[PDB]
Design a protein around this ligand. Structure first.
Ligand code: KRU
Ligand code: CA
Ligand code: NA
Ligand code: ZN
Length: 369
């Protein structure tokens, strides 16, 4: 279906935001990604834009005015004055107050909304925002290191021009904030694959299918530890194909959280970069306007590898396994290769479990008109 025009969103300041000592979320991984893909020469094939800072007006298309006013006002130096408000909005522990928190939100969000605008205007086929994908943020509360739900905001932008928008989430966590925003509408179908069972956020059971007009428009594929490329690949393509057939969206948002990779400091899946990127390849085959977003990922060398390779996939550009020299070269030792190996961990997702969950979701997809 041809090679695609790709617009890529990046602000060079993003890597300077720091969640605090010991916090596993490292915005610097976005800068490592960017530097790696520049050193592969991928800037020659795509348009690179610096996102605007999304305004409080843009954010309150979804989020409450009280919550956004709080995020814009809270700082490490006035936290004592806001103790009550911090608890109301779930800020101060997993979602710390840090210097430049609101600007981080603005840049994360600006990339996603700007990409959606570019898609709406038919000026690109794909838009990429690796600083986006903050799927846990809720209307009036922070959650799981997420403050502003850039994904929901981008989908609201797409809904100006698209009757039906499909959201797909391959982060190891359930995309609960996105699901919740659109749970009672048929104008967005949310599809999340995630680890389920004693695992954050605790949502995304098979049986959560939407409500009201949105009944059957939320799809959740709960998984166990140790899922591998072959097991994931054999459910992802059939599920997404059936979704595309039955729902017929006109735009797609794909959250590419890299915490579903093998060796992730917080995740317990066993995907390689190739296995993760196969999801991008599958979605790309439908030739629909596509917004590719970031997400989790805590082994930062593997995040940079993953999103570099997925940018190359978006561009249909073959890149060598030998990493080019770059500003973070030592982070890619001891091998200095792009691709990763799976671990020897047991896959707790038996082939029968995978088929059975698939069959249950197919029964739900038969309820669409
Ligand atoms: O990986 C996650 C969530 C965050 C989310 C994200 C993406 C991009 C930037 C900020 C945030 C990706 N998925 N986690 C939530 C959570 C909550 C509590 C203990 C560990 C974890 C890990
Ligand atoms: Ca997910
Ligand atoms: Na929905
Ligand atoms: Zn995650």
């Amino acid at each position: 279906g041809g090679k695609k025009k790709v617009c890529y969103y990046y602000d060079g300041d993003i890597g300077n935001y720091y969640y605090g000592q010991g916090h596993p979320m490292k915005p610097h991984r976005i800068r490592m990604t960017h530097n790696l893909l520049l050193n592969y020469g991928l800037y020659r094939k795509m348009e690179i834009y610096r996102p605007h800072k999304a305004t409080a007006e843009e954010m309150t298309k979804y989020h409450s005015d009280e919550y956004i006013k709080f995020l814009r006002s809270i700082r490490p130096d006035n936290m004592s004055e806001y103790s009550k408000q911090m608890q109301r909005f779930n800020v101060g522990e997993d979602c710390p107050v840090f210097d430049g928190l609101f600007e981080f939100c603005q840049l994360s969000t600006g990339g996603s909304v700007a990409g959606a605008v570019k898609l709406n205007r038919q000026q690109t086929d794909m838009a990429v925002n690796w600083a986006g994908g903050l799927h846990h943020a809720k209307k009036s509360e922070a959650s799981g290191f997420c403050y502003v739900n850039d994904i929901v905001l981008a989908i609201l932008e797409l809904l100006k021009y698209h009757q039906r928008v499909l959201y797909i989430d391959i982060d190891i966590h359930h995309g609960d904030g996105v699901e919740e925003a659109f749970y009672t509408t048929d104008r967005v179908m949310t599809v999340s694959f995630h680890k389920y069972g004693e695992y954050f956020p605790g949502t995304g059971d098979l049986r959560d299918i939407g409500a009201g007009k949105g009944k059957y428009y939320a799809v959740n594929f709960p998984m166990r530890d140790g899922i591998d490329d072959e097991s994931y690949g054999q459910i992802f393509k059939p599920i997404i194909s059936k979704v595309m057939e039955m729902y017929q969206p006109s735009a797609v948002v794909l959250q590419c959280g890299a915490d579903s990779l093998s060796g992730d400091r917080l995740g317990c899946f066993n995907l390689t970069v190739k296995g993760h990127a196969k999801c991008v390849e599958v979605v790309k085959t439908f030739n629909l306007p596509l917004l590719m977003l970031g997400g989790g990922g805590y082994t930062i060398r593997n995040v940079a590898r993953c999103w570099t390779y997925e940018t190359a996939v978006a561009l249909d550009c073959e890149i060598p396994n030998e990493l080019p020299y770059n500003d973070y070269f030592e982070y890619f030792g001891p091998d200095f290769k792009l691709h990763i190996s799976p671990s020897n961990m047991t896959n707790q997702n038996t082939p029968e479990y995978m088929e059975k969950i698939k069959q249950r979701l197919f029964e739900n997809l038969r309820m669409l008109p």
